[PDB]
Write a protein that binds this ligand. Sequence first.
Ligand code: MG
Lengths: 200, 7
Amino acid sequence: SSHHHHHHGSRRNIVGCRIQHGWKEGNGPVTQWKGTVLDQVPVNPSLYLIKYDGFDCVYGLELNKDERVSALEVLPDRVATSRISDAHLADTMIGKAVEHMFETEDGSKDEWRGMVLARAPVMNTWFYITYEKDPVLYMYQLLDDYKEGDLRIMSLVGKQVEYAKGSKRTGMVIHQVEAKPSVYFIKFDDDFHIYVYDLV
Amino acid sequence: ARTKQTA
Ligand SMILES: [Mg+2]
């Protein structure tokens, strides 16, 4: 965000780019983060959706405006053009409820009910997914899970929302899932997770 | 199968 002067500020298009930056929360140390920018929210173009290396959840961050971000560098690395291994499975998987198997410590089975929401932008071979017992936005290469037998297959945008916790968290509806139009992405203030709910 | 991380 450069003040190309006075009332104007210009901004590089970083959708699809690898980025790295520092992160400082309160009186902690700066931590180092490296991620792939997936999208820029239409109803709030300073808000980006980001997949960070080593974190399964997708995060929503105002990368240019959030004071907690420092030394924001967009990298020259280009995400490799991948073709999806089984396109038919990939396409038919969208919008479907799924049983996604996860291991806990020393191999006890933990099966999570979920819903595949979409093919991820930018990172072609990855899928947007959320879970009944954890309604935030996750990202995984599900065709790997499927081939290993670990995956079994079975507009309000712009509006604000409020959610009761003896508290109230307010948030905004930022995206409608194309495969299932009654399912939306929600970004709450002071939470960088993307929440996923059916708002029927 | 995958392992679950934490928030
Ligand atoms: Mg179950």
